[PDB]
Enzyme design. Structure first.
Site, PDB file in Angstrom:
ATOM      1  N   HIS A 107     -73.070  56.415 -19.269  1.00  0.00           N
ATOM      2  CA  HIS A 107     -72.032  55.859 -20.168  1.00  0.00           C
ATOM      3  C   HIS A 107     -71.055  56.953 -20.601  1.00  0.00           C
ATOM      4  O   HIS A 107     -69.923  56.585 -21.073  1.00  0.00           O
ATOM      5  CB  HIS A 107     -72.651  55.201 -21.414  1.00  0.00           C
ATOM      6  CG  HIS A 107     -73.354  53.923 -21.131  1.00  0.00           C
ATOM      7  ND1 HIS A 107     -74.638  53.884 -20.618  1.00  0.00           N
ATOM      8  CD2 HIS A 107     -72.962  52.640 -21.286  1.00  0.00           C
ATOM      9  CE1 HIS A 107     -74.992  52.618 -20.438  1.00  0.00           C
ATOM     10  NE2 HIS A 107     -74.000  51.838 -20.881  1.00  0.00           N
ATOM     11  N   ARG A 281     -70.253  37.266 -24.208  1.00  0.00           N
ATOM     12  CA  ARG A 281     -71.698  36.911 -24.245  1.00  0.00           C
ATOM     13  C   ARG A 281     -72.055  36.429 -25.649  1.00  0.00           C
ATOM     14  O   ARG A 281     -72.121  37.276 -26.545  1.00  0.00           O
ATOM     15  CB  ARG A 281     -72.606  38.097 -23.910  1.00  0.00           C
ATOM     16  CG  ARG A 281     -74.091  37.782 -23.943  1.00  0.00           C
ATOM     17  CD  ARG A 281     -74.951  39.026 -23.776  1.00  0.00           C
ATOM     18  NE  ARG A 281     -74.670  39.565 -22.463  1.00  0.00           N
ATOM     19  CZ  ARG A 281     -75.251  40.617 -21.899  1.00  0.00           C
ATOM     20  NH1 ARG A 281     -76.209  41.278 -22.524  1.00  0.00           N
ATOM     21  NH2 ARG A 281     -74.841  41.008 -20.704  1.00  0.00           N
ATOM     22  N   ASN A 284     -76.051  32.743 -28.546  1.00  0.00           N
ATOM     23  CA  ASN A 284     -76.775  31.474 -28.333  1.00  0.00           C
ATOM     24  C   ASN A 284     -77.628  31.618 -27.083  1.00  0.00           C
ATOM     25  O   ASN A 284     -77.043  31.830 -25.975  1.00  0.00           O
ATOM     26  CB  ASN A 284     -75.844  30.278 -28.205  1.00  0.00           C
ATOM     27  CG  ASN A 284     -76.543  28.972 -27.891  1.00  0.00           C
ATOM     28  OD1 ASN A 284     -77.721  28.919 -27.583  1.00  0.00           O
ATOM     29  ND2 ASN A 284     -75.791  27.886 -27.932  1.00  0.00           N
TER      30      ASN A 284
HETATM   31 CA   LIG Z   1     -76.509  31.989 -23.641  1.00  0.00          CA
END
Ligand SMILES: [Ca+2]
Ligand SMILES: [Ca+2]
Length: 482
Positions: A107, A281, A284
């Site tokens: 990174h 993203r 949920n």
């Molecule tokens: Ca999902």
């Protein structure tokens, strides 16, 4: 086509690469102490990230010095006229996964920019969400007064003679928090330590040059299902940057949204505006999308991005953004008919560009989470809106790619195939990709990074080979638009 190789120059025989093994949560506290360099994510750290920038007749490049035992931040200037590479060695050495230099951290790129207004040089490097913490913290106190890492030069440095192109052009940290006579790492870009918390917990340094020659910068907060992009701007006259400003609120559920979301994609200064395009993203975990869903795009009419944000249909966007539905273009999920929780896999294959002509392009990819199911589906998608079209054209007649570029009238796929760069070229606002360039002999490459400028591709590459010190090459490829 007009596409061909203008020059290949070797920059160094010895840049850092992680040649050891992949550790995980179970093994990262016991890395190899032998010749091999173990790593937690990826093996790539040199010729990676925003590490290559042309300026006038020069190319500037960043890399980490090769040797698992070296790891110095390096800055090279290539005079494309004289052929001369002149390299500055910085004291800072790659500090590794959570500050253990025995574990390579992919990174931790060195982002680079040069002001065309005052000839200053800027580097932000070796960062993965670091904060001030203590022995009990995830970082074990390793980043106190050093959690944001910025180096910068006096005015005119980019232009000095090779003799004068030295560390002595870079401004030392003489703050109350200075780690001493060799500390070149600034904790803020504002030059005011009052601002240190605004520079806290950030990753992925990326720079842009505005049409009027202003430098913009942005980095990323958070990860997984809760993230924000933060951007700032260079004040050339006062030789300092502004504080970071958010594109979107983090903790979106506390700011009125139904769920937290992360962002996967990029902000880009393109076709004269700061713009953004990504896949979200959601937190949920009961819906059909195991990871990402959607495509999202907005742009700012404000020079510095401080408001006047719009979606693709020119509808005013809530800023900072809370509800990703305001700027959603389409759902790649529509292109697969799985209904069960977590059945739809969207991660790899996304990028986006806007042509000089205002043709808006998105590439993505969607497959079944379950690769063994009888009715498995995998599709690549090109979504594009030609400059003077109502709606998007959305096609699966596309083989997929990790990046998309634009120069002049055209869009490009550029990458490696069995070790050799290729260019695919299509008119902006079309899906008519053709291979027009393929290198087919010479040393092969492991990986690199592309910057598009002046209707050329600057391909900053690491040569294939064994071990942790490998050669860097720069290819200048004319893209045939010029
Ligand atoms: Ca999902
Ligand atoms: Ca410092």
């Amino acid at each position: 086509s007009g596409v061909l190789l203008e020059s290949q120059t070797k920059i160094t025989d010895g840049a850092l690469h992680f040649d050891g093994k992949k550790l995980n949560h179970n093994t990262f506290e016991n890395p190899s102490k032998s010749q091999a360099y173990d790593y937690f994510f990826g093996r790539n750290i040199s010729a990676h990230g925003d590490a290559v920038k042309p300026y006038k007749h020069f190319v500037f490049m960043t890399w980490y010095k090769g040797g698992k035992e070296e790891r110095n931040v390096m800055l090279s200037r290539f005079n494309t006229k004289t052929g001369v590479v002149k390299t500055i060695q910085f004291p800072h050495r790659h500090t590794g996964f959570r500050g253990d230099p025995l574990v390579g951290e992919s990174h931790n790129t060195i982002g680079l920019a040069v002001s065309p207004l005052n000839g200053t040089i800027h580097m932000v490097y070796d960062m993965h969400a670091y904060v001030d913490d203590d022995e009990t913290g995830r970082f074990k106190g390793r980043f106190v007064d050093d959690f944001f890492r910025y180096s910068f030069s006096v005015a005119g440095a980019a232009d000095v003679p090779d003799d004068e192109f030295t560390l002595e052009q870079f401004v030392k940290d003489t703050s109350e928090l200075s780690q001493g006579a060799d500390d070149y790492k600034h904790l803020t870009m504002t030059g005011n330590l009052q601002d240190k918390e605004n520079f806290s917990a950030l990753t992925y340094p990326k720079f842009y040059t505005s049409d009027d020659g202003e430098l913009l910068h942005y980095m990323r907060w958070g990860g997984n299902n809760n993230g924000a992009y933060y951007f700032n701007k260079y004040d050339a006259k006062n030789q300092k940057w502004t504080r970071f400003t958010p594109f979107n609120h983090k903790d979106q559920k506390t700011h009125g949204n139904a769920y937290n979301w992360g962002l996967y994609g990029q902000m880009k200064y393109i076709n004269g505006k700061l713009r953004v395009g990504f896949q979200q993203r959601s937190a949920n975990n009961d819906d059909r999308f195991k990871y990402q869903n959607g495509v999202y795009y907005a742009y700012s009419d404000h020079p510095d991005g401080l408001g006047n944000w719009k979606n693709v249909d020119g509808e005013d966007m809530t800023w900072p953004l809370v509800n990703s539905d305001e700027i959603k273009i389409f759902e790649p999920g529509d292109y697969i008919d799985h209904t069960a929780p977590n059945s739809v896999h969207i991660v790899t294959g996304f990028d986006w560009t806007v042509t000089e002509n205002d043709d808006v392009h998105f590439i993505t990819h969607v497959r079944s989470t379950d690769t063994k199911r009888s009715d498995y589906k995998e599709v690549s998608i090109h979504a594009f809106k030609p400059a003077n079209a109502v709606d998007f054209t959305i096609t699966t007649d596309f083989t997929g790619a990790d990046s998309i570029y634009t120069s002049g009238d055209s869009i490009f796929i550029i990458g490696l195939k069995n070790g050799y760069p290729f260019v695919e070229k299509a008119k902006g606002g079309s899906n008519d990709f053709e291979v027009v360039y393929q290198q087919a002999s010479g040393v092969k490459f492991d990986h690199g990074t592309i910057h598009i400028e002046n209707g050329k591709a600057y391909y900053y590459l690491m040569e294939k080979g064994a071990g942790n010190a490998l050669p860097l090459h720069l290819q200048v490829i004319d893209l045939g638009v010029t």
